[PDB]
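$ run holo --ligand "sodium ion" --emit tokens
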Amino acid sequence: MLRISQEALTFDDVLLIPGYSEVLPKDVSLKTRLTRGIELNIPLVSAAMDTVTEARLAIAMAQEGGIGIIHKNMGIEQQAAEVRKVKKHETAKAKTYPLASKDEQGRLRVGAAVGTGADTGERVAALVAAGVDVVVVDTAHGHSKGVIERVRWVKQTFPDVQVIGGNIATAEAAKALAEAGADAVKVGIGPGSICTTRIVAGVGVPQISAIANVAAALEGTGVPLIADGGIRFSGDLAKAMVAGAYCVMMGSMFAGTEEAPGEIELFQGRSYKSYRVPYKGALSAIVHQLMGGLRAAMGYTGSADIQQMRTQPQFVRITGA
Amino acid sequence: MLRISQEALTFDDVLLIPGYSEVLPKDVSLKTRLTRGIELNIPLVSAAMDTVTEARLAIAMAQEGGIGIIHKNMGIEQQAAEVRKVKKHETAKAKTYPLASKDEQGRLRVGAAVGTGADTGERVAALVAAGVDVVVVDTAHGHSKGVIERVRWVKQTFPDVQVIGGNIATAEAAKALAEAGADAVKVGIGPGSICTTRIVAGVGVPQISAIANVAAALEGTGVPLIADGGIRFSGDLAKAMVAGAYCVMMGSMFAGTEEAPGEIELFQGRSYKSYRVPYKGALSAIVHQLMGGLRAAMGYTGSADIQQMRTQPQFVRITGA
Amino acid sequence: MLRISQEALTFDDVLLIPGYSEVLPKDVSLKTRLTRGIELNIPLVSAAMDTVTEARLAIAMAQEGGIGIIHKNMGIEQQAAEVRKVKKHETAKAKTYPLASKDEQGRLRVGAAVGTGADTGERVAALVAAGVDVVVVDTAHGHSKGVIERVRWVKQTFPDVQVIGGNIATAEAAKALAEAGADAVKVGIGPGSICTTRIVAGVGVPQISAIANVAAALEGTGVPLIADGGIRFSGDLAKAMVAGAYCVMMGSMFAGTEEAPGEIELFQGRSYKSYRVPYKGALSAIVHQLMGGLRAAMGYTGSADIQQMRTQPQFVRITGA
Amino acid sequence: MLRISQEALTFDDVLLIPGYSEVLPKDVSLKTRLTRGIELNIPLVSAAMDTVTEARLAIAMAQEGGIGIIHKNMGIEQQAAEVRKVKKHETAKAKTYPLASKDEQGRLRVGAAVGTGADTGERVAALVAAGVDVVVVDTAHGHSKGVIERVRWVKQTFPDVQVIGGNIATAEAAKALAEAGADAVKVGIGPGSICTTRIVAGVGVPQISAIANVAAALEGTGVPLIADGGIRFSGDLAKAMVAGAYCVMMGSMFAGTEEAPGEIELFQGRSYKSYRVPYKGALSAIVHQLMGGLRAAMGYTGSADIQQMRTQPQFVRITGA
Amino acid sequence: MLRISQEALTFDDVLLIPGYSEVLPKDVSLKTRLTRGIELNIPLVSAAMDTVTEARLAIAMAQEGGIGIIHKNMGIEQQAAEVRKVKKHETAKAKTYPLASKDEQGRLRVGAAVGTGADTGERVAALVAAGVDVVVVDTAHGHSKGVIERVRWVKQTFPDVQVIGGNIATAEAAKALAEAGADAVKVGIGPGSICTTRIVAGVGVPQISAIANVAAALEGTGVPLIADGGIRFSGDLAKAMVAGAYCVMMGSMFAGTEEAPGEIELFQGRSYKSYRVPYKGALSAIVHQLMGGLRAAMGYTGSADIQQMRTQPQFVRITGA
Amino acid sequence: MLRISQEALTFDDVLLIPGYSEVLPKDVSLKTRLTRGIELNIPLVSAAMDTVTEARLAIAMAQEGGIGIIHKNMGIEQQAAEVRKVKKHETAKAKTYPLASKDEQGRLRVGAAVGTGADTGERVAALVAAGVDVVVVDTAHGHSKGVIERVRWVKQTFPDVQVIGGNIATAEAAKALAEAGADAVKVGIGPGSICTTRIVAGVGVPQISAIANVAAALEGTGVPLIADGGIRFSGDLAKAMVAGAYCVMMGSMFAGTEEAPGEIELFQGRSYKSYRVPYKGALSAIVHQLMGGLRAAMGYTGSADIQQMRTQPQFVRITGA
Ligand code: NA
Ligand code: NA
Ligand code: NA
Ligand code: NA
Ligand code: NA
Ligand code: NA
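-- output --
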């Protein structure tokens, strides 16, 4: 008698099935897209969190072949200044980053988040003027009048900038954002078992089904979808891609790295970052783990590139046992 | 080979799906009904428990826009006296409660519980004479000859008073109580995983399915249903409404508040209520949490009012994982 | 591709649904049958375990209106002597046991277990000569040539004695034992999640489905089935009856009672029985709990007697959550 | 919307159903095959792990009626020398091993593992020259060009030696290996809930379904399949056989035995093997437990031999509860 | 600079030193005195606690050769009635208690407690009229005007009854009570590490030193001292005697016995006494343990009787280690 | 060879010895002094902590008969304003506080803390002008040039105000502060086992010996000493007085009371104070516990008033055991 739409699956509900393979993990291609107009060499984005992405980590992310989204928990001038640092960054003498995400002028790519408040227009304008590549209209409920209208306003006001809208979790929301002119959508509403959205509001969609529903809705449109939340280890990342994601956004896993905000401190005979989270060392080692696991899964499933990984492998569904 | 009626779901089995929204949580309407004849400004009732509802908390509940049901674990004269205090309460000078549940004479509304024992008739008469708004025929098994007959006797003897019958958990029981003339039904038999009904008798219906089965049975009759049990946080409350409940009854969550029975004492360097349960401070802060979470869910699902919340949003079913 | 017969349910998978009731728990009838020819006033049997049933507990069990099965972990002469004590027991002056299970000569009823070894024939003969009411051919795998042949031999050699065969867990095994002439069957192979049969051999049938499959197979034959294992509290007992059991056998729950074998000793400032298990006091208090819970379930489901309890109420199936 | 092939079951999801039995556990036959051309008296193989199988344990395994696969984590000359020790081993005076796995010259049988690296050809040649009975092309992903080609190369280069290919987990992979000329396949990709393949790559197939899918694919071909992983106790072993396995490979359960590599040391007042794992005493006691449990399951299901055990008994599927 | 009287030792601070022995534990004498005028066959008293001593346990205590002190947490008439039951108790036919504590008329001996409130005089009179052997003026601080005056009043008003005063913990208090005419003193103020006297008031004397200080003060006076508190096992009891105690009072160790107040109930599958404490079975088994341990210590120290045990053996003092 | 001054004792090292008593706890006198010129009706001071003492709690403290010291973790104007609120507070109509600490104009007494920084002079002046009764020169190391000079400056600049200097822990420091003109001293350097002074600097004096050393040094001078730290329950408070303290300062035990700073919030279904610490309800209940325990100890030791409590009772020293 309940109005139940479907059973929805999370990462722990499924496993990838091995398939005939003739391309080794070291030889697969990880190239993909963030948005209609922005290509990435690896399917990885850093979250717009004040513990994760300011200019320093955004620069590292772009150097690795992904991209960072600078957070908005700061003044407009300050956020614009973080964007400028990335766009103006010049490669260290004696270092080479051949995977680096760059715009046509050869500058490192960067994103920045905005919300829907009364100073949003002013914030977007400052970010665009600072040379931002993509504006992320980033809210708790993207399938809403306010977000959809803000996405339209950005596309109308600044036609030359890429725009991401989110967060969403349904086919209908994906279509609405696409129609509003989003160049990509970000997927994740209550994706984790422990999130506050579930406990406070009783709301959420398990992330594997959320991703797959949004992927089917956007199939053949050219609009990428970004998976945002619920991913705990590299195995989950591979599952997200096979569910249909074009790339994955990481947050707290990147907090506490050298490039992330905060300062290293001694605590309990041990290094932490203080603003405390465990110090994690260089971002590059985490990226290596994540992308090594993805490469392994591509080898197991016989996927030679991301387009094959997203569309060809199958899951088995498993039990609690 | 087993006689299995259906699979029955509890709160943890389901999540609300986000929907297109254009009304913010702060702007939704929470108005609803307790019974055919009694409207509430918020969907919240306090339980007829001796740790929860006497006059002081009943007054606070009505001031918040809900209602309290005074417990029956006391003498008839005493319970009647608690009802009288509520009906005679005059608003503090310099305070305003614009949401307050009031009868046509402008007196705060109140309920009181009775059972089915030999002095029930006398107890009901005293409560009615004290000015009670609703009599709750409140038993462990409402789908029984004794309860159904008592509900009929109250409707026959005191036609001008509202009557709630319970507790029930099935479509057939809802219809039987409606036919007996109940102005609302209360839903919950073994709703919690930890309840004694399940352990001692092996009996129970998971509350999400119990609510939805009773809602379908009463659809189009004008008889409200009250959800009673199994609700641990605000997210569960929202799920109960979407399953079809008109309002929700809270018990132990309200015990230990300032307005609840008992006296504050120091225990282990910390405040408790003694008769011990943790002291919780003012009832209003709990109500704020519960209704804030409900408002959040209404925003997420795009429900502008309770009637939409009860009938329009969908669930996903999830796994243990 | 697996050869899966069915999904099988255990007690924790299901709950009883409340039904229209007009007979109170105190007023329901608990009368039932152990075998074609033996009626019990309560649906309770004590297990043939050396920690549970010798003459003293068998006498108490019969006085309560059930029956005990004397264990076979002793010499033939000794086991026969235990049977004789029960048959010769004379009611204490000034005590009355109006529910007592008695044969036509007015002697307390008793059972005794045998296996299939080389001295089984001699053991059966001694038990029968001692006046046993029912012989329980009691093995780990009753659906076997050895057990079926022993059941036939008992029916052929001693036509005037009742015979129970077990243990079984399938419809086919029930039919085979019935055909061999069993007056009842005992159900339970790997019924518990923790049993050695599951861990060592990978073998078992969850007890709710085992009971229901055996009940359907024996429907209309007049052959009772006894549920043996997996029952942890009174709620499980009620579920076993509704699944189709005629009565339930308890083992370790009865160990450590005053009437059970062993001697009380002080251990860790606390009473135990030593041969150690916690001392549990008088058997009657455990029986009261078990039968009180069954009565409660009968009231909830509106079952006026055991025949209605076995055939009329329904379950809901529930999730892990 | 997800590409889900099937629900896949693990050992804990299923139980064996008892069946009519007239052959006791002590009397069943355990004879089976490792490969097209190699018969075993018990369905047990030791893993090619450096903590498990060198010559000493391989000799014990063959004496018990199974076989060991010598690991490849050593130089080619060294691995060849381990094979030679087994082939040249002469039975101790005054000992008799009537179950022993022997070739036609009466020498104990032995296997050895190889991978796919650049010195594989040389390694295979040395093993064959040392008199190995079976070469195990043993990789993490057997359904790959490299493994399939290596299996073909072994069959072409050394037509008189048996070859096992693995590991696989699907019907398609089984067919590919059979076509490449494998004399058996080894089954197990991410079979355990805790394995690194699942966590790092998100890849795996629950072992009960993996076994059954491979069994169906190879039905009527004469190609055996070996179950490799996920088996924790003897009950799991029996389930693997009924799922379709011809024999089972054990690894870490055999580590720490007297015959396994490593040296006994005192640690925390207790014996360990150091290279540390608990000392387990003689291999024969573990084999006895495993085969005793299998015999018990064969008795319960009424399977007189392995061919009946693999093809006749049924499972029930059970819940988390 | 602190005013420290001495270091005070508790039971855990000391051990008894073995001495030359030629009398076995079974052959030592346990005879002693409760008061100037009352001899006991064992050095054991039951506490005046409402969970420990009413008539039933007092009778058992006297039968064992000790004595019970009936508690005062009841009406005066009720307490007098408990005393009367003991004095009027006639030995069961076919039982013999050759150690029994009896007065000159051959009636079982019994004590009863009083405090210092306004109805104390009336309470004492009722107890004496009921035939009590000893009145225990029993307070938290016996070295006080109120207690000393009450002890004098009892000795003056009822010269033929024995009187115990307590509780005390110093030489000065012992002398004051002796001077007031106490026939014995009871020792124990904050004796346990966990008592409320220490936590609330910061007051207490470790029991081994309290006993020894009181013993020295009363040496040569003929006034016994009773040790009351801090004794956890039989070893402590022996230490208390060697420290100078004439007998030992037990409280909570006796609660939960068959003879103690309360009724047996099933709780968590296990027997308790409810008023809950663990059921302990018959008092006699506890007494046997306590006196067996005392006998063992007497053997080890070569003490042939209580007078030697109290005056001859030595302790070693030990460290925390 | 170490330079060890003495063994130093903490509260857990000692217990109070009971003494002859003829004054009941309810009848003892708790009157004492804070400073040469300020008398208190109870020996209790609240700490100058920002979680403990602002005007609201200072007013409650003075009403109870003690005094509060307003903290200095705020601007000078703000701290002066808190002092003014206390001095200007007028007793609620219909309340009577007969124990209240008042100055000669009948205004509630209050203290305030200062340190030694560059704005200290200005801070002291503002406090004095606001009508403060006592200035507490409150530092981590009072036996220092800076503190001693500041104490002199306050006595010189404002001769009519009382001054407390601290913290100290030795006889020499007490004499130095007395000579500088302190009207009282505050005792406590590393008094707790868990304090940072001990862990970081290795510095501290166990509080019982610190108190007694300071008491002996100030004997006959008329200068009170205040015990500050290490006191966990009322029993410790009594021990501090007997060690020689005139009154005791409490900190964190008072944090979280209604009168203390912070605001009540719901957290984990339970009331806390947020700025989080457990909500403790009204200050008066804590004071009642502390002073009830002190009264109990005075009764036990036979101390009729504080002067007797400080000078007459004795301790026993106890072991870890
Ligand atoms: Na492919
Ligand atoms: Na809507
Ligand atoms: Na019925
Ligand atoms: Na068969
Ligand atoms: Na001696
Ligand atoms: Na005194």
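-- notes --
Chains F and C do not touch (no CB pair under 8 Å).
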